[PDB]
């Protein structure tokens, strides 16, 4: 078929890469009624890693991230969800400071020197963030990124879902949206079947199932799914007013926090290598069950919280960043799932055996900032127009390294070994 006549199913279309793909199909002139978004949960999916009050907009010298940054500034659908507060990337101790100097030097060497400034003392840091405590940031240096800030993530995906609804995109959710298998005819994918038995037929299928991708089809451990954690504190209107338009504050050895949302709520994250949840599971294409990391979904198990070890790290972030708030209860604790490749690059490729089935995953914990742009690259993959360098960087690559460690400091620990999260 031609493009007005091409049917495409986006599996995981309630999440980050999937909603972006559906948007870029519509914007590229695919007929909205020929696009079907399938998700386990209605857009924005309650288990999407993008279903979050906030994410950091930390675009670097990377072409895709920079193209995304421009859309967060200029695109009429997205721009209202980007808060250009700036970002403090803070470092403490001999090794982290040396790595921050080098990151700074690299950004100068890459021609972003005008967007960033080196803060060489605590006085320089308190100038940009006077709500910090001088005592707790003794010896800290920072890169202040003027271009940075934070993204109203769940609101941005919701806004894509409302736009797609109004265009006449087709939806299937719950049993009617939860992918079970591809429909294959002589090695060609011609649609999908969901858990309730519903079949959808299309010319092309995109698997944008995030941390669920390696659970749904055999990916030969090129993606390993891991959880990260957050909790919330509630500020009085007077407390929240002191933090209005605060930059994002990050320290790789502490974690990070955001300015309060419109309800006075501050989200706090630690910084760590993520948690697996290994269990026996048989993805489509696997000859028998395998021990793989299967997300433990907060949407399916809303009584779940986070490990005790995670609460302690978040309390330490609050004690370091916001000592006056050590007494506030930490609430709406949740695990948030991503999938790492060995090299931390995306997995955006045609399936090597199932023609017209495409992977769009490998988010590796840092892809929410790509929400505006990433579906453009997926449409280019479907159309055969993706740049060779990106076709290689995002290629099918089992056996290319250990995704349990990936490019992080250590192999992820497992939730089986981390008490405090399960309240069943
Ligand atoms: C705590 C945390 C903090 C983060 N901070 C940042 C940050 O500051 N900046 C940044 O850029 N990135 C950040 N990230 C990373 C970012 O959130 C992810 O890289 C990105 O959102 C992943 O997008 P995705 O589309 O691959 O997955 P998702 O958005 O999770 O989408 C996957 C979708 O697949 C659906 N699905 C699952 N199973 C099925 C099925 N059987 N059938 C159909 N659909 C299914 C899910 O319901 C979901 O909607 C953070 C992530 C977490 C968890």
Residue numbers in the entry: 3 to 426
The paper states:
In the present study, we set out to enhance the thermal stability of the L3-35A mutant by implementing a methodological approach whereby different thermal stabilization strategies are tested in parallel and their efficiency compared. These various strategies involved mutations to either improve the RMSF of the protein (generating mutants hereafter referred to as D-series mutants), increase the number of salt bridges (C-series mutants) or form disulfide bonds (X-series mutants). Our MD-based ranking led to the selection of six candidate mutants (C16, D02, X01, X02A, X04, and X07) for experimental production and characterization. The D02 variant, which relative to L3-35A features two additional mutations (V110R and D115G), shows an increase in Tm of ≈ 1.5 °C with respect to the parent enzyme. We observed that the activity of the enzyme variants towards fK and fV remained similar to that of the parent enzyme, with a slight increase of activity in the case of D02 and a slight decrease in all the other cases. Overall, we observed that the activity of these mutant enzymes is several folds lower than that of PnFPOX, the naturally occurring enzyme. Also, similarly to the parent enzyme, none of these mutants shows any activity towards the dipeptide or the hexapeptide. In this process, while the amino acids that are directly involved in the catalytic function were not modified, some tunnel-lining residues were replaced. This could explain the reduced activity of both the L3-35A enzyme previously reported and its thermally-stabilized mutants described so far (D02, C16, X01, X02A, X04, X07). At the structural level, the tridimensional architecture of all mutants reported herein is maintained, confirming that our mutagenesis campaign did not impair the conformational stability of the enzyme. We then compared the residues in the catalytic site (W235, E278, G372, R415) of our mutants with those of the WT enzyme.
Fructosyl peptide oxidases (FPOX) are deglycating enzymes that find application as key enzymatic components in diabetes monitoring devices. The inability of wild type FPOXs to act on intact proteins is the most critical issue limiting both their diabetes detection efficiency and their protein deglycation potential. This is due to their buried active site and narrow access tunnel, as determined in multiple crystal structures. In that account, using a rational design approach involving a five-amino acid deletion at the entrance of the active site and a number of further mutations, we described a stable PnFPOX mutant (named L3-35A) that, relative to the wild type enzyme, features a significantly wider and shorter access tunnel.
